[PDB]
């Protein structure tokens, strides 16, 4: 029951030997999951706070683990004042580890008791302490309370600014201290002041770690506080082109990818032009891959429509579509596919066949090596094939023709993926049945001796695309299919799935 279990846990708590006490304390959250009754939760947390107050630091650490795990059941605490009052008493202990565990406790309880001003004062006083563990615990609790309280955030932003600008604060503590600022999204002037501070940080502390941490937390802050998003985008592009460090450029790429994933509509034509200039200019294929991933993400959205005939984006995507590296080629041809399926200008008519032959080249490139990266690039290219045949249906005959001519020579995994692509294309337009049906059928003969692993899935996919191609009755062809199944499958699950597709 509930009461019985709580009594057993309290008996374990009073045991006075540390092993049973720790066992009982860490047993508490499972009890909460068993019986989420608010009277039980309140009484149990009261007992936990009481053992927290009087008990060695390892027991307090177990209690901290419980409170971190049972964050949702904190909402069902009624005697909040008494609970926090006896948790808070151990902040006066002269033992810095006890203070550290207490600060982390208050950080775990920031959700239920923000705006408890004595707790704020404890975070603020413990921030400038001497013990390193106490300062880190104060930093963690400050992060939580800044996420919760607006008053605490505005009160602590000045302390953090003077702490970074302070000189007795070492570099690693500064590094841990910066990303408190990502929680200054409660107010416009608060966010603007935090932005000013972050600009001062990157100019005055130009080390790789500190610029990375600062410009990444500035990105998150501007992401939450939507007013600062365009200047954040232009700062990231500026750092991508100017800062020579590969780590800084990689961060600029990753967090611009974050911004393009969440607010693509706020991207301007100037930002996309600047990013395209960066991509054309860079000699490093990893950077080119990264910002081309950003470009493909943008091109998936409406940002291309906002971007708009020939331009640096188009020149980029044509140039990178035939790149030696497979990933750059995959992303560039995805960009081409998105631009082609978006607009219907008269210059785009020349662009579509460029895209088609790019997809052709990707099939020739990625259909042999069978590497997992090859599977990724092949999936990107085939999804692009499906996209521009569905969106530009007058261009599907050539797509299917190159798929047919390539299906003979591709490996088994590439055959599975191309059969899936071809099945999608065939499902979306019916005017190509008998011919391509015969070619896939003459392909079907040689499937009995391909391999041992992918043979079954290849048979399923090939029979599926055979059925999609077909629109009539077949007798000798069904005899060939059945003979193949009896000869090589002898499994049934493949036969059942093939029969499912036939139905």
């Amino acid at each position: 029951d509930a009461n019985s279990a709580l009594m057993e846990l309290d008996k374990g708590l009073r045991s006075g030997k540390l092993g049973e006490q720790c066992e009982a304390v860490v047993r508490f959250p499972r009890l909460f999951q068993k019986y989420p009754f608010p009277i039980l939760i309140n009484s149990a947390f009261l007992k936990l706070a009481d053992v927290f107050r009087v008990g060695n630091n390892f027991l307090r650490l177990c209690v901290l683990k419980v409170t971190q795990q049972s964050e949702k059941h904190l909402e069902k605490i009624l005697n909040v004042d008494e609970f926090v009052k006896r948790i808070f008493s151990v902040i006066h202990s002269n033992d810095p580890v006890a203070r550290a565990i207490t600060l982390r406790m208050l950080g775990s309880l920031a959700s239920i008791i923000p705006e408890r001003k004595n707790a704020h004062h404890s975070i603020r006083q413990s921030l400038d302490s001497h013990d390193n563990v106490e300062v880190e615990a104060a930093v963690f609790a400050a992060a939580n309370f800044s996420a919760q309280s607006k008053d605490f955030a505005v009160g602590i932003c000045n302390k953090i600014s003077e702490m970074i600008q302070g000189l007795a604060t070492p570099v690693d503590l500064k590094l841990k201290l910066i990303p408190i600022l990502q929680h200054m999204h409660h107010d416009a002037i608060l966010a603007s002041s935090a932005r000013q501070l972050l600009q001062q940080l990157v100019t005055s502390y130009p080390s790789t770690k500190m610029v990375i941490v600062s410009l990444h937390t500035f990105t998150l802050l501007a992401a939450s506080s939507l007013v600062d998003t365009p200047k954040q985008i232009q700062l990231l592009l500026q750092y991508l082109k100017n800062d020579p460090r590969k780590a800084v450029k990689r961060l600029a790429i990753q967090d611009l990818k974050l911004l393009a994933n969440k607010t693509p509509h706020t991207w301007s034509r100037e930002n996309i032009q600047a990013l395209c200039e960066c991509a054309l200019q860079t000699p490093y294929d990893s950077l080119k891959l990264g910002m081309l991933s950003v470009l493909s993400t943008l091109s998936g959205t409406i940002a291309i429509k906002h971007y708009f005939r020939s331009s640096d984006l188009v020149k980029l995507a044509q140039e990178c579509c035939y790149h030696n590296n497979r990933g750059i080629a995959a992303h560039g041809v995805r960009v081409l596919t998105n631009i082609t399926v978006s607009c219907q200008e008269k210059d785009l008519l020349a662009l579509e066949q460029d895209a088609v032959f790019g997809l052709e080249s990707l099939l020739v490139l990625c259909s042999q090596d069978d590497s997992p990266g090859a599977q990724a690039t092949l999936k990107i290219a085939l999804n692009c094939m499906v996209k521009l045949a569905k969106g530009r249906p007058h261009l599907s005959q050539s797509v299917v023709e190159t798929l047919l001519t390539q299906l003979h020579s591709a490996q088994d995994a590439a055959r599975i993926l191309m059969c899936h692509c071809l099945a999608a294309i065939a499902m979306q337009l019916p005017v190509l049945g008998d011919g391509m049906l015969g070619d896939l059928m003459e392909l079907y003969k040689v499937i009995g001796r391909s391999a041992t692993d992918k043979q079954q899935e290849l048979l399923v996919s090939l029979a599926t695309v055979i059925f999609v191609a077909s629109q009539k009755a077949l007798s000798v062809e069904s005899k060939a299919v059945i003979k193949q199944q009896l000869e090589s499958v002898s499994n049934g699950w493949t036969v059942y799935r093939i029969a499912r597709q036939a139905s």
């Binding site: 999936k379 990107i380 999804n383 899936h420 699950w493």
Partner: peptide, 28 residues
């Protein structure tokens, strides 16, 4: 994540109880 055939019946690797039981009972 990325998928070629959006509507593919073989996509689901771990299936419901009916198809799992039918698979184990016929994959031999």
């Amino acid at each position: 994540d990325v998928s070629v055939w959006e509507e593919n019946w073989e996509d689901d690797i771990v299936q419901d109880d009916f198809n799992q039981q039918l698979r184990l009972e016929m994959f031999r």
